[PDB]
């Protein structure tokens, strides 16, 4: 039975509106409704992994597990294994996997972050799950961010708090937040970003939706505009939206957007919006293709419609050689040449690098680089040809070219990271000096750049 090189992952996000679901929700797991939908011919084909994110979920974990498992079994005739379930307040994440994956899945982590302070702490935040699938790390975040058209700044702050404080993945990757810890990261939920148009335009917006004309609406989507100005979700992908806004509906139909201010809304308008979203971020040159992204038309218990997205995702085997794991493979080495970091920092400390990778027995600290003044004010840290030679555990190119090196640049004075990034070893050539490049981030904001040349030696 061969180990896979590809899996399909289903991501669902639904704000249930504190209402139990209808008896049939199979349309969700089949990616049927509006947008980029799944072909009929695939309906009996199970996804390898189903990650279900809910918000305003009124069910017990047991009640929702019963509905989810029975739903998938009806569709696929497969009895899915529960990998993880985590619930913060009414925010919930469920990971289900095909039974043949049970002994491929290990190192399962769960965590939550509560966002806000005093007034604003009590119901918003994120739940998450991470695990290894053979040699591939996977993380999943379900976030319910701050509501309200006039709170996109709050939403961006909620995002930065979740990505700083959600403790998933390999704790040995201590310089690195969840946006660097996984081969594939999926971040979904009721992100709560709104179509920023005047309240007087509501009926015009509704008109535009009935005509399936979304272009002039998406140009005002706060998530799309905030991402374009690099305020939020830096270096995440989102598939093109081709489905009507998923909020706010009158319940028990989809024929009406309920946007007018009411006591129940705190006297706030809820203009039709894409509150309900799936974004991802994969390590450089790993296969990840979105195969669906849409909303259901036929689940109407909530003022939100469910959103599905499906993904082909590249996975690797748990590699064993004669040598590593348990030693180095002297036939392998990773060399950095002519490397410099550019940092936006005003500080004057010395910097050193840390190289972290599952292809190394443990992380490698460099010597300090040489600080220069850049033309336009910047700090440029020069490493030149000083950087330590990295000793992979396995030299087999079938392993090593599928790996990645995480880079942190750290203050000698404080040992704090000023920047994190990632280099793919999926090079055009081995035993050849080749350009490498990663942006550097800290708390998921741009702090600089790292570039140079790599020279990779493999057993071939
Ligand atoms: N949060 C909990 O109560 C857990 C959830 C289920 N579980 C597992 O071990 N699930 C599992 C592990 C590896 C591969 C496939 C499935 C034990 C208890």
Swiss-Prot record:
UniProt keyword terms in alphabetical order: Apoptosis, Cell membrane, Cytoplasm, Cytoskeleton, Hydrolase, Immunity, Lipid metabolism, Membrane, Phosphoprotein, Repeat, SH2 domain, SH3-binding
GO molecular function (one): phosphatidylinositol-3,4,5-trisphosphate 3-phosphatase activity
Tissue-specificity statement: Specifically expressed in immune and hematopoietic cells. Expressed in bone marrow and blood cells. Levels vary considerably within this compartment. Present in at least 74% of immature CD34+ cells, whereas within the more mature population of CD33+ cells, it is present in only 10% of cells. Present in the majority of T-cells, while it is present in a minority of B-cells (at protein level).
Transmembrane residue ranges: none
Single GO BP term: signal transduction
Post-translational note: Tyrosine phosphorylated by the members of the SRC family after exposure to a diverse array of extracellular stimuli such as cytokines, growth factors, antibodies, chemokines, integrin ligands and hypertonic and oxidative stress. Phosphorylated upon IgG receptor FCGR2B-binding.
Protease keyword on record: no
GO CC, any one term: cytosol
Location in the cell: Cytoplasm; Cell membrane; Membrane raft; Cytoplasm, Cytoskeleton
Function: Phosphatidylinositol (PtdIns) phosphatase that specifically hydrolyzes the 5-phosphate of phosphatidylinositol-3,4,5-trisphosphate (PtdIns(3,4,5)P3) to produce PtdIns(3,4)P2, thereby negatively regulating the PI3K (phosphoinositide 3-kinase) pathways. Able also to hydrolyzes the 5-phosphate of phosphatidylinositol-4,5-bisphosphate (PtdIns(4,5)P3) and inositol 1,3,4,5-tetrakisphosphate. Acts as a negative regulator of B-cell antigen receptor signaling.
Family of the protein in this entry: Belongs to the inositol 1,4,5-trisphosphate 5-phosphatase family.
Oligomer status and interactors: Interacts with tyrosine phosphorylated form of SHC1. Interacts with tyrosine phosphorylated form of DOK1. Interacts with tyrosine phosphorylated form of DOK3. Interacts with tyrosine phosphorylated form of SLAMF1/CD150. Interacts with PTPN11 in response to IL-3. Interacts with receptor EPOR. Interacts with receptors MS4A2/FCER1B and FCER1G. Interacts with receptors FCGR2B and FCGR3. Interacts with receptor FCGR2A, leading to regulate gene expression during the phagocytic process. Interacts with GRB2. Interacts with PLCG1. Interacts with tyrosine kinases SRC and TEC. Interacts with c-Met/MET.
Free-text domain note: The SH2 domain interacts with tyrosine phosphorylated forms of proteins such as SHC1 or PTPN11/SHP-2. It competes with that of GRB2 for binding to phosphorylated SHC1 to inhibit the Ras pathway. It is also required for tyrosine phosphorylation. The NPXY sequence motif found in many tyrosine-phosphorylated proteins is required for the specific binding of the PID domain.
UniProt protein name: Phosphatidylinositol 3,4,5-trisphosphate 5-phosphatase 1
Protein's organism: Homo sapiens (Human)
Gene that specifies this protein: INPP5D
Shown stretch of the complete protein: 398 to 857 of 1189
